[PDB]
mmCIF file of C-alpha atoms and ligand atoms in Angstrom:
data_model
loop_
_atom_site.group_PDB
_atom_site.id
_atom_site.type_symbol
_atom_site.label_atom_id
_atom_site.label_comp_id
_atom_site.label_asym_id
_atom_site.label_seq_id
_atom_site.Cartn_x
_atom_site.Cartn_y
_atom_site.Cartn_z
ATOM 1 C CA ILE A 257 -1.322 6.578 9.299
ATOM 2 C CA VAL A 258 -2.917 9.717 10.770
ATOM 3 C CA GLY A 259 -6.102 9.529 12.845
ATOM 4 C CA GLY A 260 -5.929 5.725 12.802
ATOM 5 C CA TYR A 261 -5.863 3.059 15.518
ATOM 6 C CA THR A 262 -3.604 0.233 16.682
ATOM 7 C CA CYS A 263 -4.578 -2.646 14.429
ATOM 8 C CA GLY A 264 -3.673 -5.440 16.807
ATOM 9 C CA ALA A 265 -0.800 -7.844 16.152
ATOM 10 C CA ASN A 266 -1.181 -9.687 12.880
ATOM 11 C CA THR A 267 -4.751 -8.568 12.333
ATOM 12 C CA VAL A 268 -3.659 -7.551 8.820
ATOM 13 C CA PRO A 269 -1.765 -10.660 7.833
ATOM 14 C CA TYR A 270 -1.279 -9.581 4.228
ATOM 15 C CA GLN A 271 0.478 -6.427 5.338
ATOM 16 C CA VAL A 272 4.180 -6.275 4.529
ATOM 17 C CA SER A 273 7.061 -3.958 5.296
ATOM 18 C CA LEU A 274 9.671 -3.252 2.666
ATOM 19 C CA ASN A 275 13.004 -2.814 4.457
ATOM 20 C CA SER A 276 16.424 -1.573 3.390
ATOM 21 C CA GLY A 277 18.075 -1.170 6.766
ATOM 22 C CA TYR A 278 14.891 0.604 7.770
ATOM 23 C CA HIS A 279 11.170 0.600 7.002
ATOM 24 C CA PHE A 280 10.506 2.698 3.897
ATOM 25 C CA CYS A 281 7.258 1.416 2.335
ATOM 26 C CA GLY A 282 4.330 -0.943 2.672
ATOM 27 C CA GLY A 283 3.139 -3.763 0.424
ATOM 28 C CA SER A 284 0.494 -6.490 0.176
ATOM 29 C CA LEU A 285 1.015 -10.235 -0.066
ATOM 30 C CA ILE A 286 -1.021 -11.612 -2.955
ATOM 31 C CA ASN A 287 0.400 -15.162 -3.066
ATOM 32 C CA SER A 288 3.233 -16.981 -1.262
ATOM 33 C CA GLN A 289 5.822 -15.510 -3.565
ATOM 34 C CA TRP A 290 4.502 -12.146 -4.755
ATOM 35 C CA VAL A 291 3.907 -8.786 -3.131
ATOM 36 C CA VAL A 292 2.079 -5.769 -4.516
ATOM 37 C CA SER A 293 3.418 -2.289 -3.743
ATOM 38 C CA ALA A 294 3.914 1.099 -5.374
ATOM 39 C CA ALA A 295 6.284 1.890 -8.236
ATOM 40 C CA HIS A 296 7.543 4.930 -6.334
ATOM 41 C CA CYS A 297 8.719 2.498 -3.655
ATOM 42 C CA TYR A 298 11.138 0.967 -6.103
ATOM 43 C CA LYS A 299 14.728 0.580 -5.023
ATOM 44 C CA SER A 300 17.414 -2.052 -5.044
ATOM 45 C CA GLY A 301 18.202 -4.134 -1.985
ATOM 46 C CA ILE A 302 14.648 -4.790 -0.870
ATOM 47 C CA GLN A 303 14.012 -7.131 2.025
ATOM 48 C CA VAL A 304 10.361 -8.077 2.512
ATOM 49 C CA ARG A 305 9.240 -8.467 6.111
ATOM 50 C CA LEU A 306 6.102 -10.550 6.638
ATOM 51 C CA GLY A 307 4.182 -11.215 9.846
ATOM 52 C CA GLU A 308 5.293 -7.959 11.400
ATOM 53 C CA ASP A 309 3.596 -6.016 14.156
ATOM 54 C CA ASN A 310 6.364 -4.209 16.047
ATOM 55 C CA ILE A 311 8.779 -3.457 13.231
ATOM 56 C CA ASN A 312 11.575 -2.574 15.686
ATOM 57 C CA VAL A 313 11.465 -5.743 17.740
ATOM 58 C CA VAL A 314 11.664 -9.432 16.889
ATOM 59 C CA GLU A 315 8.507 -10.787 18.559
ATOM 60 C CA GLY A 316 8.033 -14.081 16.710
ATOM 61 C CA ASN A 317 6.016 -14.861 13.544
ATOM 62 C CA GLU A 318 8.336 -12.768 11.400
ATOM 63 C CA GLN A 319 9.654 -13.925 8.056
ATOM 64 C CA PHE A 320 12.358 -11.868 6.375
ATOM 65 C CA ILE A 321 12.717 -12.726 2.678
ATOM 66 C CA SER A 322 14.762 -10.862 0.081
ATOM 67 C CA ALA A 323 13.169 -9.753 -3.150
ATOM 68 C CA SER A 324 14.425 -11.680 -6.168
ATOM 69 C CA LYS A 325 12.803 -9.176 -8.484
ATOM 70 C CA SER A 326 10.948 -5.873 -8.416
ATOM 71 C CA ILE A 327 8.810 -5.116 -11.435
ATOM 72 C CA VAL A 328 7.743 -1.503 -11.888
ATOM 73 C CA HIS A 329 4.804 -0.917 -14.265
ATOM 74 C CA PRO A 330 6.487 -0.226 -17.658
ATOM 75 C CA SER A 331 4.183 2.779 -18.027
ATOM 76 C CA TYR A 332 4.850 4.128 -14.514
ATOM 77 C CA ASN A 333 5.256 7.922 -14.682
ATOM 78 C CA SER A 334 7.182 9.423 -11.829
ATOM 79 C CA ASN A 335 5.987 12.926 -12.546
ATOM 80 C CA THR A 336 2.265 12.197 -12.416
ATOM 81 C CA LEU A 337 2.358 8.814 -10.617
ATOM 82 C CA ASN A 338 0.100 7.194 -13.207
ATOM 83 C CA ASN A 339 0.481 3.423 -13.030
ATOM 84 C CA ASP A 340 1.961 3.636 -9.529
ATOM 85 C CA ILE A 341 2.214 -0.122 -9.049
ATOM 86 C CA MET A 342 5.050 -2.618 -8.590
ATOM 87 C CA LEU A 343 5.340 -6.402 -8.336
ATOM 88 C CA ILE A 344 7.966 -7.942 -6.020
ATOM 89 C CA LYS A 345 8.908 -11.603 -6.245
ATOM 90 C CA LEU A 346 10.278 -13.206 -3.124
ATOM 91 C CA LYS A 347 13.525 -15.169 -3.265
ATOM 92 C CA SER A 348 11.690 -18.071 -1.647
ATOM 93 C CA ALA A 349 7.993 -18.601 -1.054
ATOM 94 C CA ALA A 350 6.617 -17.363 2.237
ATOM 95 C CA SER A 351 5.253 -19.931 4.646
ATOM 96 C CA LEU A 352 1.591 -19.040 4.824
ATOM 97 C CA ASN A 353 -0.121 -19.171 8.203
ATOM 98 C CA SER A 354 -2.754 -17.318 10.177
ATOM 99 C CA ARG A 355 -0.322 -14.472 10.716
ATOM 100 C CA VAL A 356 1.053 -14.441 7.145
ATOM 101 C CA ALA A 357 -1.649 -14.618 4.502
ATOM 102 C CA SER A 358 -2.475 -13.398 1.019
ATOM 103 C CA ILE A 359 -5.125 -10.819 0.129
ATOM 104 C CA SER A 360 -7.419 -11.384 -2.864
ATOM 105 C CA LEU A 361 -7.300 -9.340 -6.050
ATOM 106 C CA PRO A 362 -10.675 -7.760 -6.925
ATOM 107 C CA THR A 363 -12.985 -9.196 -9.516
ATOM 108 C CA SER A 364 -14.732 -5.839 -9.903
ATOM 109 C CA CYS A 365 -13.733 -2.248 -9.156
ATOM 110 C CA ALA A 366 -15.150 -0.761 -5.951
ATOM 111 C CA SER A 367 -17.776 1.940 -5.922
ATOM 112 C CA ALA A 368 -17.843 5.369 -4.308
ATOM 113 C CA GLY A 369 -18.741 5.229 -0.621
ATOM 114 C CA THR A 370 -17.292 1.747 -0.219
ATOM 115 C CA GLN A 371 -15.598 1.432 3.170
ATOM 116 C CA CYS A 372 -12.020 0.142 3.149
ATOM 117 C CA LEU A 373 -9.154 -0.705 5.488
ATOM 118 C CA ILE A 374 -5.925 1.237 5.089
ATOM 119 C CA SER A 375 -2.845 0.275 7.110
ATOM 120 C CA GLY A 376 0.804 1.101 7.544
ATOM 121 C CA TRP A 377 3.732 2.089 9.737
ATOM 122 C CA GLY A 378 3.955 5.562 8.213
ATOM 123 C CA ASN A 379 3.911 8.946 9.907
ATOM 124 C CA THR A 380 1.086 9.411 12.392
ATOM 125 C CA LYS A 381 1.229 13.267 12.403
ATOM 126 C CA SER A 382 -0.635 15.644 10.049
ATOM 127 C CA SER A 383 2.223 18.035 10.748
ATOM 128 C CA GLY A 384 5.597 16.984 12.084
ATOM 129 C CA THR A 385 6.730 13.396 12.468
ATOM 130 C CA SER A 386 6.011 10.379 14.629
ATOM 131 C CA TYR A 387 6.587 6.854 13.343
ATOM 132 C CA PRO A 388 4.959 4.035 15.288
ATOM 133 C CA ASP A 389 6.474 0.684 16.182
ATOM 134 C CA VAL A 390 3.228 -1.252 15.668
ATOM 135 C CA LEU A 391 0.857 -1.377 12.744
ATOM 136 C CA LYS A 392 -1.787 1.338 12.405
ATOM 137 C CA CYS A 393 -5.167 0.954 10.797
ATOM 138 C CA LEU A 394 -7.636 3.430 9.279
ATOM 139 C CA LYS A 395 -11.164 2.900 7.991
ATOM 140 C CA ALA A 396 -11.903 5.118 4.994
ATOM 141 C CA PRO A 397 -14.572 5.509 2.319
ATOM 142 C CA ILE A 398 -13.774 5.619 -1.389
ATOM 143 C CA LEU A 399 -14.695 9.076 -2.686
ATOM 144 C CA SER A 400 -16.649 9.979 -5.785
ATOM 145 C CA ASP A 401 -14.982 10.734 -9.103
ATOM 146 C CA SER A 402 -16.081 14.335 -9.102
ATOM 147 C CA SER A 403 -15.097 14.870 -5.486
ATOM 148 C CA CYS A 404 -11.711 13.414 -6.178
ATOM 149 C CA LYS A 405 -11.082 15.397 -9.347
ATOM 150 C CA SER A 406 -12.416 18.486 -7.614
ATOM 151 C CA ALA A 407 -9.849 17.880 -4.931
ATOM 152 C CA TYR A 408 -7.016 17.561 -7.499
ATOM 153 C CA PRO A 409 -8.017 19.051 -10.842
ATOM 154 C CA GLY A 410 -6.252 17.461 -13.797
ATOM 155 C CA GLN A 411 -4.157 15.307 -11.464
ATOM 156 C CA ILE A 412 -6.432 12.259 -11.304
ATOM 157 C CA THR A 413 -6.214 9.518 -13.901
ATOM 158 C CA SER A 414 -8.523 6.600 -14.525
ATOM 159 C CA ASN A 415 -5.875 4.588 -12.646
ATOM 160 C CA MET A 416 -6.406 6.577 -9.456
ATOM 161 C CA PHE A 417 -9.077 6.975 -6.781
ATOM 162 C CA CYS A 418 -9.448 9.093 -3.664
ATOM 163 C CA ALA A 419 -10.301 7.567 -0.279
ATOM 164 C CA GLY A 420 -10.569 9.314 3.044
ATOM 165 C CA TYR A 421 -12.036 12.381 4.692
ATOM 166 C CA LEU A 422 -12.367 15.929 3.383
ATOM 167 C CA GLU A 423 -12.668 17.395 6.845
ATOM 168 C CA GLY A 424 -9.109 16.364 7.637
ATOM 169 C CA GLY A 425 -7.471 14.456 10.502
ATOM 170 C CA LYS A 426 -7.489 11.020 8.935
ATOM 171 C CA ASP A 427 -5.258 9.884 6.119
ATOM 172 C CA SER A 428 -2.435 7.621 4.998
ATOM 173 C CA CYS A 429 0.963 9.372 5.128
ATOM 174 C CA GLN A 430 4.751 9.058 4.654
ATOM 175 C CA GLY A 431 5.887 5.517 5.268
ATOM 176 C CA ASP A 432 2.491 4.120 4.352
ATOM 177 C CA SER A 433 3.332 4.249 0.643
ATOM 178 C CA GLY A 434 2.807 1.063 -1.338
ATOM 179 C CA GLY A 435 0.540 -0.350 1.376
ATOM 180 C CA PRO A 436 -2.949 -1.809 1.083
ATOM 181 C CA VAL A 437 -6.396 -0.390 0.722
ATOM 182 C CA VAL A 438 -8.629 -3.389 1.241
ATOM 183 C CA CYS A 439 -12.387 -3.258 0.702
ATOM 184 C CA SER A 440 -14.657 -6.211 1.470
ATOM 185 C CA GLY A 441 -11.762 -8.650 1.401
ATOM 186 C CA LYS A 442 -10.337 -7.287 -1.859
ATOM 187 C CA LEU A 443 -7.183 -5.297 -2.516
ATOM 188 C CA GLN A 444 -8.658 -2.340 -4.383
ATOM 189 C CA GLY A 445 -5.993 0.237 -3.645
ATOM 190 C CA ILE A 446 -2.339 1.058 -3.116
ATOM 191 C CA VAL A 447 -1.133 4.021 -1.101
ATOM 192 C CA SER A 448 0.173 6.361 -3.783
ATOM 193 C CA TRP A 449 0.101 10.092 -3.043
ATOM 194 C CA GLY A 450 -1.584 13.203 -1.613
ATOM 195 C CA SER A 451 -0.976 16.805 -0.568
ATOM 196 C CA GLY A 452 0.587 16.535 2.867
ATOM 197 C CA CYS A 453 -1.353 14.174 5.152
ATOM 198 C CA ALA A 454 -4.818 14.598 6.640
ATOM 199 C CA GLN A 455 -5.192 18.165 5.402
ATOM 200 C CA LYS A 456 -8.685 19.499 4.784
ATOM 201 C CA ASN A 457 -10.010 18.943 1.254
ATOM 202 C CA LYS A 458 -6.798 17.053 0.351
ATOM 203 C CA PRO A 459 -7.676 13.357 0.625
ATOM 204 C CA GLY A 460 -5.445 10.355 -0.012
ATOM 205 C CA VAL A 461 -4.918 9.167 -3.582
ATOM 206 C CA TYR A 462 -4.614 5.469 -4.375
ATOM 207 C CA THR A 463 -3.661 3.222 -7.280
ATOM 208 C CA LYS A 464 -6.806 1.603 -8.744
ATOM 209 C CA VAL A 465 -5.822 -2.007 -8.474
ATOM 210 C CA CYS A 466 -8.853 -3.315 -10.311
ATOM 211 C CA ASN A 467 -7.344 -1.920 -13.507
ATOM 212 C CA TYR A 468 -4.250 -4.087 -13.109
ATOM 213 C CA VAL A 469 -5.560 -7.552 -12.375
ATOM 214 C CA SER A 470 -4.774 -8.820 -15.901
ATOM 215 C CA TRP A 471 -1.392 -7.187 -15.908
ATOM 216 C CA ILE A 472 -0.680 -8.595 -12.474
ATOM 217 C CA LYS A 473 -1.640 -12.122 -13.485
ATOM 218 C CA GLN A 474 0.218 -12.083 -16.817
ATOM 219 C CA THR A 475 3.325 -10.642 -15.252
ATOM 220 C CA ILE A 476 3.372 -13.175 -12.469
ATOM 221 C CA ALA A 477 2.658 -16.001 -14.917
ATOM 222 C CA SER A 478 5.598 -14.985 -17.080
ATOM 223 C CA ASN A 479 8.092 -14.526 -14.259
HETATM 224 N N1 UIZ B 571 -1.815 12.168 1.985
HETATM 225 C C1 UIZ B 571 -1.411 10.949 1.620
HETATM 226 N N2 UIZ B 571 -2.287 9.936 1.853
HETATM 227 C C2 UIZ B 571 -0.147 10.680 1.014
HETATM 228 C C3 UIZ B 571 0.213 9.364 0.669
HETATM 229 C C4 UIZ B 571 1.450 9.105 0.088
HETATM 230 C C5 UIZ B 571 2.345 10.164 -0.159
HETATM 231 C C6 UIZ B 571 3.677 9.900 -0.801
HETATM 232 C C7 UIZ B 571 3.802 10.133 -2.313
HETATM 233 C C8 UIZ B 571 3.555 11.574 -2.793
HETATM 234 O O1 UIZ B 571 2.813 12.447 -2.288
HETATM 235 N N3 UIZ B 571 4.457 11.823 -3.809
HETATM 236 C C9 UIZ B 571 4.525 13.224 -4.362
HETATM 237 C C10 UIZ B 571 3.475 13.590 -5.399
HETATM 238 C C11 UIZ B 571 2.675 14.770 -5.256
HETATM 239 C C12 UIZ B 571 1.706 15.122 -6.218
HETATM 240 C C13 UIZ B 571 1.547 14.263 -7.314
HETATM 241 C C14 UIZ B 571 2.316 13.099 -7.468
HETATM 242 C C15 UIZ B 571 3.289 12.753 -6.510
HETATM 243 O O2 UIZ B 571 1.982 12.402 -8.633
HETATM 244 C C16 UIZ B 571 0.928 13.213 -9.216
HETATM 245 O O3 UIZ B 571 0.677 14.382 -8.372
HETATM 246 C C17 UIZ B 571 5.567 10.881 -3.786
HETATM 247 C C18 UIZ B 571 5.342 10.024 -2.503
HETATM 248 C C19 UIZ B 571 5.903 10.668 -1.201
HETATM 249 C C20 UIZ B 571 6.987 9.728 -0.624
HETATM 250 C C21 UIZ B 571 6.872 9.991 0.865
HETATM 251 C C22 UIZ B 571 5.338 10.092 1.099
HETATM 252 N N4 UIZ B 571 4.797 10.664 -0.165
HETATM 253 C C23 UIZ B 571 1.990 11.468 0.197
HETATM 254 C C24 UIZ B 571 0.742 11.733 0.777
HETATM 255 CA CA1 CA B 572 8.847 -7.362 14.588
#
């Protein structure tokens, strides 16, 4: 996260780190046994780490649970990142508590200008690299269709939205991928892509989770 702030330990209790001997992506807990992340975060050997604040230190409240399955959207396209969403089933259910909690799926898409919370352990530098130990937060508005498509002509599908700031300095970034964009208590977005981080007129692009609620529920129900 670039231009963000220290969230505070466990203030984002649905926030998850995907780990494979290191942090590589974020995710969101949507029930005790399922996490939502990005398809480009797919890999084998995923350990899900819940209740994390300092990802480099065992502080208490952590739960490490291996993924039993990782389900990439069958229509995911790695070239364009359309359908950049993945479901991860945990080997065992998480124990839910104040510090480990699910985030609600939306019942309606969000509108332009809606303010959302974006969080992650990704790079905190627009240029260069600095990865934080503790969770970073960023408040960001959802941008208009035209703005978004103007930012990235022919690159924006109906399964994508822009959120962020056109003036630069505040964006999601590397390491934040697959993490949540939560608006009014609903998971509306997944960190998907962008051109660099926090560059002027190049805002963050996010998977439009409201288009996948049916898919999400049918897939979970069948697995
Ligand atoms: N500025 C951002 N908020 C931001 C967030 C995530 C990433 C990710 C993804 C990314 O940029 N990919 C490359 C890419 C570029 C253009 C494009 C794409 C994909 O599909 C349609 O058009 C990929 C990941 C990459 C993994 C490390 C962080 N990157 C980038 C910027
Ligand atoms: Ca920790």
